[PDB]
Amino acid sequence: KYENHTVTLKILMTLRYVVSDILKESRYQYTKFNQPKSKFENLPQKLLL
Amino acid sequence: VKAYMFGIVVQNPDTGQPMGDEFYNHILERAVGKAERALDISILPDTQHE
């Protein structure tokens, strides 16, 4: 029925992102309290999406 | 004792060593001694030559 008609839509789509830069990229702690020995833990990165 | 401290665990922060039962028994023995003085009582079965 709509061979030569126009069609328009209002649509919902899932949010999506890509990492375009990594910022304040690494933060660190030698956690030692209440451990058998010194341990290295990487704290949260910040991403610019 | 641990049951009354449910959810609390005690360790040496420099190591992974929690205190063993030896300390608890030792503490409990002196605790039952202290209660034995707190009322003028004998609190464990014990023979007496009087």
Task: Give CA–CA dist A19/A21, Å, rounded.
Answer: 6
Distances (CA, A) of B3 to A9, B8, B9, B28, B32: 64, 9, 11, 14, 18
How far does the CA of residue B27 sit from the closest CA of chain A (Å)?
A: 24
Resolution in A: 4.3
Burial code (b: 16+ CB inside 10 Å, e: under 16) for B11-28 equals: eeeeeeeeeeeeeeeeee
Task: Please name which of B33, B32, B30, B23 lies closest in space to residue B2, comparing C-alpha atoms.
Answer: B23
Any A CB within 8 A of B9 CB: no
Asked if A38 and A32 count as a contact pair (C-beta separation under 8 A), the reply is yes
Task: Give CA–CA dist A31/A44, Å, rounded.
Answer: 15
DSSP A45: P
How far does the CA of residue B18 sit from the closest CA of chain A (Å)?
A: 11
Residues, chain A: 49
Method: cryo-EM
Contact A35 B11 (CB under 8 A): no
A38, two tokens: 């010194």
Distances (CA, A) of B45 to B26, B32, B41, B42, B48: 19, 13, 11, 8, 10
